[PDB]
Design an enzyme around this catalytic site. Structure first.
Site, short mmCIF file in Angstrom:
data_model
loop_
_atom_site.label_atom_id
_atom_site.label_comp_id
_atom_site.label_asym_id
_atom_site.label_seq_id
_atom_site.Cartn_x
_atom_site.Cartn_y
_atom_site.Cartn_z
N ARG B 9 37.99 38.72 49.41
CA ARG B 9 37.58 37.57 48.63
C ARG B 9 36.95 38.06 47.33
NH1 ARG B 9 33.06 34.83 47.40
NH2 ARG B 9 33.31 32.58 47.00
N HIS B 10 37.24 37.38 46.22
CA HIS B 10 36.67 37.70 44.92
C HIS B 10 35.14 37.61 44.92
CE1 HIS B 10 35.73 33.46 44.24
NE2 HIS B 10 36.90 33.20 44.80
N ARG B 59 39.88 34.62 38.88
CA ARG B 59 38.76 35.21 39.58
C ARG B 59 39.28 36.15 40.65
NH1 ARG B 59 38.49 29.77 42.99
NH2 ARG B 59 39.44 29.00 41.06
N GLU B 83 43.60 29.41 46.17
CA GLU B 83 42.55 28.66 46.85
C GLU B 83 43.01 27.26 47.26
OE1 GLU B 83 40.07 28.26 48.72
OE2 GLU B 83 38.42 28.99 47.45
N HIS B 158 40.85 34.15 48.48
CA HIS B 158 39.74 33.20 48.41
C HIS B 158 39.29 32.90 49.84
CE1 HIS B 158 40.94 32.37 44.23
NE2 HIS B 158 42.18 32.35 44.68
#
Lengths: 208, 212
Positions: B9-10, B59, B83, B158
């Site tokens: 995940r970012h 992102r 996402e 995400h």
């Protein structure tokens, strides 16, 4: 929301199945207990309960020293009893009963003869979680809500108890992969019986 | 005979996620978000991944680029790793949402088949993303292969997608998908797909959930 952290103890000398044999942490295992104590002590544990097997208990004492907390002990947190497999290596077990070790992990109701199933292990430990919910007002309390109860236990129990609390169907219990040495898992209990508490998995098998 | 799949995940974005819905809005990493991408690549890039595939939201992509730089891999992108789309809730604060539809936001988390108007449920996100994993099984013969059976495929994605895809791969009943919690900033999850020769028969297990 109540946080429950479970720590698998560090490395023993034993490849070789232990179950409820009271084996010792190796040198490396002690070094791992100290490292994990540091990591988990930063979460500011509310309370520590340990299986009475020494590999768990000696790990929990190091966490107690780090946090200045007094370790509590409960036999219901012992590793799964592995019946006729206790004391045997994978190579021995696999030569003796080919493919059984691998099939065992895929069926939570199945036990080595004379041993406990994962279902047995969840059945005997889960009442302990319920008891702590009843007796520890501070736990998920208004003052210090995120302070976790820490259980110092064994890989098999962590997976069985975790799947039970999450209320995963038994057939899906193998979705949880084995915990590594000195690794930890976190569940969160969200809201008014114990049963109504909805557990979610926050962390699985983080290295400590 | 086990294929390792790591999902990253970012890191942090300049956006109040805790009080305000992001979804597919293409928000930027904050400065901390960038530092977290570098740090996460140092951990995940230590061993060379087989492949990096990223959400095209910046992102995630910017996070994946740090990993590609660390490992000398290109970053492939796929809209199917986006996402969860949050429809009419996108850009709205929790307060706005909680005033319009009291109880909806909390109920949503507990029902993987429910989606805000205009958006996607967990089940919808699994529907677009699970076939991408199946495509990679088909297109990466080295993956879990005899030579280096441990090199992972890395998806840079995400939190909501990690949970949806992971529950779908694990074949949890849809009723039990909410048992998978949140993923932190720059945290990763790993599954292992253990061996017929069809994709459906691969049995996935959760090795790690939400490590930092």
């Amino acid at each position: 929301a109540r946080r429950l952290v479970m720590l698998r103890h560090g490395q023993t000398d034993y490849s070789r199945m232990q179950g409820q044999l009271d084996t010792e942490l190796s040198e490396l295992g002690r070094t791992q207990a100290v490292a994990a104590a540091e990591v988990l002590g930063k979460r500011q544990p509310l309370l520590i309960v340990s299986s009475d097997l020494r590999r768990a208990y000696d790990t929990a004492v190091k966490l107690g020293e780090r946090t200045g907390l007094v370790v509590r002990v409960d036999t219901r947190l012992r590793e799964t009893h592995l019946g006729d497999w206790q004391g045997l290596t994978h190579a021995q077990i696999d030569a003796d009963a080919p493919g059984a070790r691998l099939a065992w992990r895929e069926d939570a109701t199945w036990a080595p003869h004379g041993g406990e199933s994962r279902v047995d292990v969840a059945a005997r430990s889960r009442p302990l979680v319920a008891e702590l919910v009843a007796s520890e007002p501070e736990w998920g309390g208004a003052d210090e809500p995120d302070r976790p109860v820490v259980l110092v236990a064994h890989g098999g129990l962590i997976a069985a108890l975790s799947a039970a609390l999450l209320k995963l169907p038994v057939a899906n219990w193998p979705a949880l992969g084995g915990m590594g040495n000195a690794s930890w898992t976190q569940l969160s209990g969200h809201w008014s019986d114990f049963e109504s508490i909805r557990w979610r998995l926050d962390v699985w098998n983080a290295s400590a």
